[PDB]
Design a protein around this ligand. Structure first.
Ligand code: CTP
Ligand code: CA
Ligand code: CA
Length: 438
DNA sequence: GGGGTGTGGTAG
DNA sequence: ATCGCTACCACACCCC
């Protein structure tokens, strides 16, 4: 057991945190794309007509954890048992659940306690541990397979288990659904063989947004080809409002209040007006949704195709720790901040950059919230506070950055015992060139 | 027109 | 028990 005032805390927390792993994996995939394309002119141009193959592992962690499960779980049956991946037994996040579990209403991100209550009597939830290294190994096989097939002009990493793959179609060639179905089946089979049993689904379209929706439609373990010319009421009727990219719970709530609780993208499509949309959810998001309901990408989303180097370049660096934060005094807080600064500066030096601006963000227990919340070591209900500072001279000096971070904490006034979370951010990064003469 | 801040949301 | 991360866009409200 490692407490937050123990020097090993950051290492142990990050070693256990699937959300840390996900961000670290995504960051590494981005750096790798940039390094492998340092000299290639890697970008779709306006001259190209393209097809999007949006490819994603089905129940990634659950699939891999099951395939690599220990002897204690040998008799577990992936097609018949409800399976989740999590650390704990009660207020522990379900990071992944298989589709048997989803058939009972279980969803990623539920707590185990919640998920158990959805099972009929006699049916047992199987909980598998995380297998972080094997998650990474399976992803390696995935990305290696995509490259080996030599059918994509551009392979864009989205995450450990997801990529957007672009095929340019010369319009001396005649693309067909049959050719695209063959490609989907090739991809699916080769990844199945290369991952030793993981399944991917695939959405295939002529827009990013349609490929994403097609992917949702294809799951589990299938593919869906829906081009703009194929659109129909049957298609839009199949989606919830938050299936749209950019629509989370808060945008969901807003659209439901504004448009009389639409229950499908078809409902929304028939009811909205661009102007009422913008008023509900904002100008840019409103325009994005409008275009999405036409099967069309917005300018911002298209940047990944036309300048992936820029989109995938990292522009800030941070850590967030909002679990296990229980400090008795300001000395221990300050030492934790210093440990976080050290960790961040290692990351900053690995990419050979300096920072010109930093931010400290904290979570403070709400005045009326229990000191020990429902989730063990959780942040519980908090108020958030943030403050930033320009450094003037770009720097990677620990002395300067750590002192300023600790000062930022001081200015926010949070008593150490009330602290429940901390985020440390380098907001602006500056390249380090060969010329460092003042 | 240019600049800034803290906050909020979504992704994956 | 249990590991509630992190990047980046968008916005509302300030300055000139
Ligand atoms: N609340 C959540 C939701 C997602 N995940 C993780 O985020 C990654 C991507 O999840 P996603 O693709 O959205 O879901 P899958 O579990 O792969 O299921 P599916 O794609 O078939 O819907 C997976 O490693 C998953 O474990 C998580 O840790 N916490
Ligand atoms: Ca997935
Ligand atoms: Ca994914």
């Amino acid at each position: 057991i490692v407490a937050c005032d123990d020097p090993d805390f950051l290492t142990s927390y990050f070693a256990h945190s699937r959300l840390h792993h996900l961000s670290a994996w995504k960051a590494n995939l981005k750096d790798k794309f940039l390094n492998e394309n340092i000299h290639k002119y890697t970008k779709i141009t306006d001259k190209d007509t393209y097809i999007i193959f949006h490819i994603d592992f089905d129940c990634f962690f659950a699939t891999v954890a099951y395939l690599c499960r220990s002897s204690s779980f040998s008799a577990c049956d992936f097609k018949r048992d409800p399976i989740v991946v999590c650390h704990g037994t009660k207020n522990s996040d379900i990071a992944s659940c298989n589709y048997v579990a989803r058939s009972y209403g279980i969803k990623n991100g539920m707590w185990v306690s919640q998920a158990e209550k959805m099972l009929p009597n006699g049916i047992k939830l199987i909980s598998l541990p995380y297998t972080f290294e094997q998650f990474q190994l399976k992803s390696e096989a995935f990305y290696s397979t995509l490259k080996r097939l030599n059918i994509f002009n551009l392979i864009l990493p989205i995450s450990i288990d997801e990529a957007v793959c672009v095929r340019i179609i010369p319009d001396n060639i005649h693309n067909t659904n049959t050719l695209n179905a063959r490609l989907c089946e090739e991809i699916r089979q080769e990844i199945f063989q290369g991952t030793n049993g993981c399944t991917v689904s695939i959405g295939c379209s002529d827009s990013l947004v349609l490929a994403r929706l097609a992917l949702k439609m294809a799951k589990p373990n299938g593919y869906n080809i829906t081009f703009k010319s194929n659109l129909s009421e049957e298609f839009w009727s199949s989606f919830k409002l938050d299936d749209l990219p950019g629509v989370g719970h808060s945008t969901l709530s807003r659209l439901e209040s504004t448009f009389d609780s639409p229950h499908s993208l078809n409902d929304l499509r028939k009811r909205y007006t661009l102007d009422a949309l913008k008023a509900s959810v904002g100008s840019k998001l409103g325009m994005k949704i409008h275009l999405a309901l036409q099967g069309q990408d917005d300018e911002e989303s298209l940047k990944i195709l036309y300048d992936p180097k820029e989109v995938l370049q990292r522009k800030s660096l941070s850590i967030d720790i909002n679990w296990g934060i229980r400090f008795k005094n300001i000395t221990q807080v300050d030492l934790f901040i210093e440990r976080g600064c050290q960790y961040l500066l290692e990351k900053l030096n690995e990419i050979n950059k300096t920072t010109s601006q930093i931010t400290l963000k904290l979570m403070r227990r709400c005045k009326d919230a229990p000191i020990e919340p429902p989730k063990y070591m959780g942040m519980g209900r908090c108020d958030s506070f943030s403050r930033s500072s320009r450094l003037g001279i770009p720097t990677n000096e620990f002395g300067i950055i750590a002192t300023e971070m600790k000062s930022l904490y001081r200015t926010l006034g949070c008593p150490p015992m009330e602290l429940r979370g901390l985020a440390l951010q380098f907001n602006k990064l500056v390249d380090v060139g060969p010329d460092n003469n003042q």
